[PDB]
């Protein structure tokens, strides 16, 4: 038993990181089959990323003045395009070790893992949460985009996310792997606003299940609300509304533990209104929303992958 | 910028994790050059577990009796033997993706990843603390012995752990990889006490430091007390005491914060006595200790591996 904020093994996305230079920009860039994906503001200058017209700077640029490395091995660039907000660079090489692997743009409140690199190298690995205003609290420092963000089905990657740019607020921003920002944000330095930050109530429920399995128990108390009650309450303290989708995810946590939803619901209530008091729950003194109930499942049943 | 409990990435691991069976008894291994190391409770049954006579048990077993899986390719066994707590069975190959490595044993409060498995299979991976009492708090099910930690030094593995058991209280406890527990513990289902947890204060002040260079400032106080006192202080909290190669470690953070480490103890101090009173340091409600000097500058500095 116990409880840790878990990560995916990250070995199947190692070997997929490349290093790309266009001119003095370097970052990373994702090596699957024979195309290198990395972000588009690669071609920009220190000046042109106030106000860049990505077309106009992509015209001036030619195969040759992309540089590609996989460790010491040098890729060929031998086709270029861009596809919305990501560079599709065709190289003379399909990566031997491509994993079997999907795109999938994921919706807030997922999580996945984040493979933190600096120049096309592996530095660490964390989990985390999409936020309700399509940001991620990361861990990223200059040189880092193109870092991408994956889960894994076994023995199968599914790439969600790519790093493209901190706000001046110190939260992070980026795309799918199809150029797509996830958000309303832009690939230029300007003033860009994240809506307010929102708590995922499914997820705290199911940390609350996962407490609940590990011995924690003091929260739980003797009370049963109804939906429009909790998300009356809910909504007082920025969380998300609890749907009915919702509760019929929760199921099997449901059955596990003899705790209904609606009952779970009215502890997380009671706990809102007044706190936890200087307890703790596994570990922590806030509630924790970046665990799905898939997480709290894979979890506590040791789901493995190839 | 932002701050993550960050792991190693675990590639080169990945590829060292074999199942190791001997009976109805399977386990995970480590598979270095001809060797695999594992857990000598495999040896044991159900029934054996309460008091085990290992090199009585051992007696009975041959060469054939231990099967090694790695992935779908059955390795054969020509030699085995039995070193503290671990048992090492020669192989007929030597692992292809053996990485550079070395075997270390850690002292506490030093930090490393785990390499959470089951049935040889990698299951996903976390960052923790070795803690004062030679216990570390993870994340395991039945069937996870033999899953490691370790850590990377640019291409270098140093495996520093090897998960032997869980303690009635929930708690974690293993061998490094010559088989000499951490801490008094034994490899038998009886009951064992660990001591006395306390917080690791020379990591809790890297951590302040790690706030300080993310924008969290509000703990800094105008006050400057003496390490006898702060020592004091520390001891009435159950904190590790501060000593003078703990100041020396936190040099660097200090310059480049320009604050003294005696002032942070201040700081500190105060927390100690005043508590957080609801705010929140680099998303947390309490003190962290997680995190060493060592990976405060590796994160803020974007250090790499092969
Ligand atoms: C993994 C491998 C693959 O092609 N798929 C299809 C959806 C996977 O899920
Ligand atoms: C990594 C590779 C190796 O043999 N060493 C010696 C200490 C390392 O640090
Ligand atoms: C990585 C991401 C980013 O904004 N830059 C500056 C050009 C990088 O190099
Ligand atoms: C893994 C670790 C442990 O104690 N067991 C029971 C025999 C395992 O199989």
Redesign the interface.
């Given at each position: 038993?116990?409880?840790?904020?878990?990560?995916?093994?990250?070995?199947?996305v190692?070997?997929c990181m490349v290093q790309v230079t266009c001119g003095t920009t370097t970052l990373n860039g994702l090596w699957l089959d024979d195309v290198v994906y990395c972000p588009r503001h690669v071609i920009c200058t220190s000046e042109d990323m106030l106000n860049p017209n990505y077309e106009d700077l992509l015209i001036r640029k030619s195969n040759h003045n992309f540089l590609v490395q996989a460790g010491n091995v040098q890729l060929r660039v031998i086709g270029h395009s861009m596809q919305n907000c990501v560079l599709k660079l065709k190289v003379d090489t399909a990566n031997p070790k491509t994993p079997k692997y999907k795109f999938v743009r994921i919706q807030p409140g997922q999580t996945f893992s984040v493979?933190?690199?600096?120049?096309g190298?592996?530095?660490?690995?964390?989990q985390?949460a999409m936020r309700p205003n399509f940001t991620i609290?990361?861990?990223?420092?200059?040189?880092?985009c193109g870092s991408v963000g994956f889960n894994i089905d076994y023995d199968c990657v599914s790439f969600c996310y790519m790093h493209h740019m901190?706000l001046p607020t110190?939260?992070?921003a980026g795309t799918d792997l199809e150029g797509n920002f996830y958000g309303p944000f832009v690939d230029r330095q300007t003033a860009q606003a994240a809506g307010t930050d929102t708590t995922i109530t499914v997820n705290v429920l199911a940390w609350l299940y996962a407490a609940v399995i590990?011995?924690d128990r003091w929260f739980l108390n003797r009370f049963t609300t109804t939906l429009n009650d909790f998300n009356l309450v809910a909504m007082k303290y920025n969380y998300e509304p609890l749907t009915q989708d919702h509760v019929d995810i929760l199921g099997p946590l449901s059955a596990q533990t003899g705790i209904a939803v609606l009952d779970m619901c009215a502890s997380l209530k009671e706990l809102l209104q007044n706190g936890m008091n200087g307890r703790?729950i596994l570990?922590?003194?806030?509630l924790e929303d970046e665990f799905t109930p898939f997480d709290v499942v894979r979890?506590?049943?040791?789901?493995?992958?190839?």
């Amino acid at each position: 038993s116990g409880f840790r904020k878990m990560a995916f093994p990250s070995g199947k996305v190692e070997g997929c990181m490349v290093q790309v230079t266009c001119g003095t920009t370097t970052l990373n860039g994702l090596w699957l089959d024979d195309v290198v994906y990395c972000p588009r503001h690669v071609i920009c200058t220190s000046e042109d990323m106030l106000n860049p017209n990505y077309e106009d700077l992509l015209i001036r640029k030619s195969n040759h003045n992309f540089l590609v490395q996989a460790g010491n091995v040098q890729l060929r660039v031998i086709g270029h395009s861009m596809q919305n907000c990501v560079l599709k660079l065709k190289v003379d090489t399909a990566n031997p070790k491509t994993p079997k692997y999907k795109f999938v743009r994921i919706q807030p409140g997922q999580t996945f893992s984040v493979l933190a690199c600096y120049n096309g190298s592996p530095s660490g690995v964390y989990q985390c949460a999409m936020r309700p205003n399509f940001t991620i609290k990361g861990s990223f420092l200059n040189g880092s985009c193109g870092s991408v963000g994956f889960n894994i089905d076994y023995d199968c990657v599914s790439f969600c996310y790519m790093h493209h740019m901190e706000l001046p607020t110190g939260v992070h921003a980026g795309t799918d792997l199809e150029g797509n920002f996830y958000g309303p944000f832009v690939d230029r330095q300007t003033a860009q606003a994240a809506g307010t930050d929102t708590t995922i109530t499914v997820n705290v429920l199911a940390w609350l299940y996962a407490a609940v399995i590990n011995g924690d128990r003091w929260f739980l108390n003797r009370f049963t609300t109804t939906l429009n009650d909790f998300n009356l309450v809910a909504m007082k303290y920025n969380y998300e509304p609890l749907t009915q989708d919702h509760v019929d995810i929760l199921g099997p946590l449901s059955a596990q533990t003899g705790i209904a939803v609606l009952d779970m619901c009215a502890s997380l209530k009671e706990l809102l209104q007044n706190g936890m008091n200087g307890r703790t729950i596994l570990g922590s003194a806030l509630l924790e929303d970046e665990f799905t109930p898939f997480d709290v499942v894979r979890q506590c049943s040791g789901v493995t992958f190839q």
